[PDB]
Design a protein around this nucleic acid. Structure first.
Lengths: 152, 152
DNA sequence: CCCCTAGCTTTAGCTATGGGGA
DNA sequence: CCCCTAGCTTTAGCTATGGGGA
């Protein structure tokens, strides 16, 4: 959910808007291709532990709203999503192979999305331990334990 | 400024709120230590091409609003920021070395910030080339040349 | 900005805060 | 969640989508 926890002690929420277009901004992302593209991206996300919040395509581009573990790195998810989908789709639909040198370009757009944390930041500080005493360890455990994670 | 470009062809704006607290949430980020802390983080940001939009400490924690090249990785800026400041600060002020086992903890808070792209995404797509014709190469070069970068 | 090579997956087709440069 | 180990910088003191587990 909105606020995750690293496998260790990193408290985060890293949502990214990602957008990239086919070679020549070709309008191939429709029908069969559009469907498989979304499926392939889905498999990559689960595998790379990326939370696809939203995802839609519109002929000459794909728009993804994703949550990504800051330790992992947005470009790793993109590298894979673009690389694989390109190999698969070009294998599945030949006009994507015979008419284009590649499926994608070396470009892509990325923007961080989120609003002023304010209170979330206050709760984070307040719950850090201020000693090794029992109460403190309990305060912290209760805090992080009540956070979302990304297994698989 | 707000919308940058990679050394290659990545059009981005990745802003992050970053917060970490001293070990034990000790209120040591004041006076001399606070000043030197900000100075150190300023040097690490410039060395790592990280843009510090805003920074402020407040006794028991430092708050940073940074813009980082998506291909660089948030944790590399934090690793160096926490890592170096700790080494230096504990070297310059002994009460930080004798009274604490480390300066920081293995925790930190990270949240992406920024609103929906909407029009910025439309302009991104509209300026992708749709062919190798000269006009398209001009439209594109023109677009990317009119974007911010991070030299040094 | 381009193209070239490394690096790694998808072993094709993508990124590298990559690199060098009429 | 903890602690251990390795990696890399600050060669101390931090992170690793790290690892393993009363």
């Amino acid at each position: 959910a909105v606020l995750y926890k690293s496998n260790h002690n990193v408290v985060y929420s890293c949502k990214y808007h990602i957008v990239w277009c086919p070679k020549y901004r070709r309008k191939v992302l429709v029908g069969a291709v559009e469907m498989r593209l979304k499926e392939i991206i889905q498999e990559v996300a689960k595998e790379l532990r990326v939370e696809i919040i939203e995802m839609q395509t519109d002929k000459d581009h794909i728009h993804i709203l994703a949550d990504i573990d800051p330790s992992f790195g947005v470009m790793k998810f993109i590298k894979t999503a673009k690389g694989r989908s390109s190999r698969i789709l070009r294998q599945e639909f030949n006009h994507l192979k015979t008419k284009l040198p590649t499926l994608w370009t070396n470009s892509c757009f990325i923007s961080t999305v989120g609003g002023a944390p304010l209170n979330v930041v206050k709760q984070y500080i307040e719950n850090q331990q201020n000693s090794n005493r029992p109460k403190q360890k309990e305060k912290w455990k209760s805090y992080v334990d009540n956070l979302q994670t990304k297994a698989l």
